[PDB]
Amino acid sequence: SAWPEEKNYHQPAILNSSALRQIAEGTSISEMWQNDLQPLLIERYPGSPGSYAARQHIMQRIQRLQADWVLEIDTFLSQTPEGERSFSNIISTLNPTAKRHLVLACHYDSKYFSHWNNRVFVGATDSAVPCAMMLELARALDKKLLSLKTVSKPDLSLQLIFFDGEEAFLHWSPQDSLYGSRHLAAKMASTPHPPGARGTSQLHGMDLLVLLDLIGAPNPTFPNFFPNSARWFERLQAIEHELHELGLLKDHSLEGRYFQNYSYGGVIQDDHIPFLRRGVPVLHLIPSPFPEVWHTMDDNEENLDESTIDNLNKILQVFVLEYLHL
Ligand SMILES: COc1ccc(NC(=S)NCCCn2ccnc2)cc1OC
Ligand SMILES: [Co+2]
């Protein structure tokens, strides 16, 4: 029947005033920084020790939560400019046999750069911070996410994806970029879902691909990229305004706010692409412009904004709760 269309009608359970204060008190940026982020601030292009440590580190964090996460490693070989490589997409699902899933993702790999002044590229905003931010969300919402084990409702849950091999080895191109996402999107496209169904794939399963990238610079501006996601975008603007109005953000002005009503001139390439081209509805939370420090050794911890990321943690968590009705 018409479960693949439930997404098109799905509405949010908008939190009340005190629930917003409650969530706000929920997340801790000090914790995330130390425990979720710092370990990831290491060289971690595919096949590197970083890659494995990052992969271990992300799984370590998730495995220690109460909510019934189900980790899966999507390892595959592909050709690259540098020769055959192994890529390992990290998927993390609650209630995986549930038909529908809201999907947050980022990329955990970093871009490769040869050593300049003994400096190593650690891709802080790009996209370690999104990583940690997802991990914080997992933690900060663990109790509330737990009640999804309780099986009344819409048959919907949360999925995380930590894509590997987003970056290009050489120069960006169809063939040298999005290795993990190009691979997992194809795989999802052709895996029946739910098990033993006719016609429908796991891609019918993705209600919305929320893709975090290049977050951590101060005062980011996000365009509203896609018509078919626009209402969910407008929720983020709605959430942002509301938290500020409640003095639950720090270092925030409505002039220097985050989600802008304007759209985007060209077309940005990222992990969402092989999904969007297969008609996954996509909410692409990449800033325009990119950070100043983008793809430069200055993409480092000295150059993140504590309050910006923390603020974005609050905003994002509310969005997820509200989507899943928790
Ligand atoms: C620096 O300003 C920009 C440069 C290029 C683009 N366009 C595209 S298609 N970017 C693809 C990004 C891939 N990626 C994601 C993370 N690390 C790499 C836009 C920019 O500013 C809006
Ligand atoms: Co990059």
Q: Are 161 and 91 in contact (CB under 8 A)?
A: yes
Report whether 295 belongs to an annotated binding site: yes
Task: Count CA atoms closer than 13 A to 237's CA, side-chain side.
Answer: 16
> Which atom of ligand 1 is nearest to 286's Cα?
15
Ligand number nearest CA of 181 is: 1
Is 213 one of the catalytic residues?
Answer: yes
Query: CA-CA distance, 13 to 322, in Å (whole number)?
Result: 5
Cβ pair 158, 320 in contact under 8 A: yes
**231: number of Cβ within 10 Å:** 12
Most ligand 1 atoms within 8 A of CB, residue of 290, 292, 296, 298 to mutate: 290
Residue 131 backbone phi and psi in degrees, to 5: -55, -65
Residues contacting 275, CB < 8 A, separation 6+? 181, 185, 203, 206, 209, 282
- Contact predicate 133/32, CB 8 Å: yes
Q: How far is ligand 1, taken at its centre, from the CA of residue 268, in Å?
A: 6
- CA-CA distance, 120 to 169, in Å (whole number)? 16
Radius of gyration of the chain (CA): 19
Please give the number of the atom of ligand 1 that sits closest to the Cα of 269: 9
Closest residue CA from atom 14 of ligand 1? 270
- Report residue 165 as tokens: 């091999």
Atom of ligand 1 nearest to the CA of 123: 17
Residues with CB under 6 A from ligand 1: 126, 213-214, 268-270, 288-290, 294
CA–CA separation, 36 and 216 (whole Å):
14
222 pairs with which residues across the strands?
Answer: 259
Distances (CA, A) of 229 to 12, 133, 182, 318: 14, 21, 21, 17
Tell me the ligand closest to 212's alpha carbon: 1
Pick from 108, 167, 99: nearest CA to 134: 108
Which strand ranges, in their side-by-side order, compose the sheet holding 69-78?
69-78, 85-94, 156-163, 100-107, 206-212, 282-285
How far apart CA 54 and CA 72 sit, in angstroms, is 15
Experimental technique of record: X-ray
Q: Do residues 309 and 1 make contact, with C-beta atoms less than 8 angstroms apart? A: no
Q: How far apart are CA 71 and CA 68, in angstroms?
A: 10
Give 115: exposed, middle or buried? Use CB within 10 Å, 0-12, 13-18, 19+.
exposed
Non-local (6+) Cβ contacts of 16 within 8 A are none
Query: 290 C-alpha to center of ligand 1: Å?
Result: 7
Judge whether 10 is annotated as a binding position. Answer: no
Give CA angle at 264 (304, 307), nearest 5°.
Answer: 20
Most ligand 1 atoms within 8 A of CB, residue of 163, 268, 271, 286 to mutate: 268
Output the 3-class SS for the chain: CCCCCHHHCCCCCCCCHHHHHHHHHHCCHHHHHHHHHHHHCCCCCCCCHHHHHHHHHHHHHHHCCCCCEEEEEEEEEECCCCCCEEEEEEEEEECCCCCEEEEEEEECCCCCCCCCCCCCCCCHHHHHHHHHHHHHHHHHCHHHHHCCCCCCCCCEEEEEEEECCCCCCCCCCCCCCCHHHHHHHHHHHCCECCCCCCCCEHHHHEEEEEEECCCCCCCCCECCCCHHHHHHHHHHHHHHHHHHHCCCCCCCCCCCCCECCCCCCCCCCCCCHHHHCCCCCEEEECCCCCCCCCCCCCCCHHHCCHHHHHHHHHHHHHHHHHHHCC
- Is 167 annotated in a binding site? The answer is yes
The domain 6-324 belongs to what CATH superfamily? Zn peptidases (3.40.630.10)
**Is the C-alpha dihedral spanning 11, 12, 16, 17 positive or negative?**
negative
Distance between CA 24 and CA 17 in Å, rounded?
A: 11
Distance, CA 264 to ligand 1 centroid (Å)?
Answer: 12
Give which of 22, 95, 45 is closest to 318, Cα–Cα.
Answer: 22
Q: Which of the residues 136, 164, 166, 310 is marked catalytic?
A: 166
105: Cβ–Cβ under 8 A, 6 or more apart, which residues? 134, 160, 161, 162, 163, 209, 210, 211, 212, 271, 272
Report d(CA 290, CA 215) in Å as an integer. 9
Candidate list 43, 74, 213, 271, residue with the active-site label: 213
What are the phi and psi torsion angles at 189 (to 5°)? -55, -30
**End-to-end Cα distance, the chain:** 26
- Residues after which the chain is broken (C–N above 2.5 A) are 151
Pairing of strands 100-107, 156-163: parallel
d(CA 253, CA 255): 5
Residues β-bridged to residue 212: 285
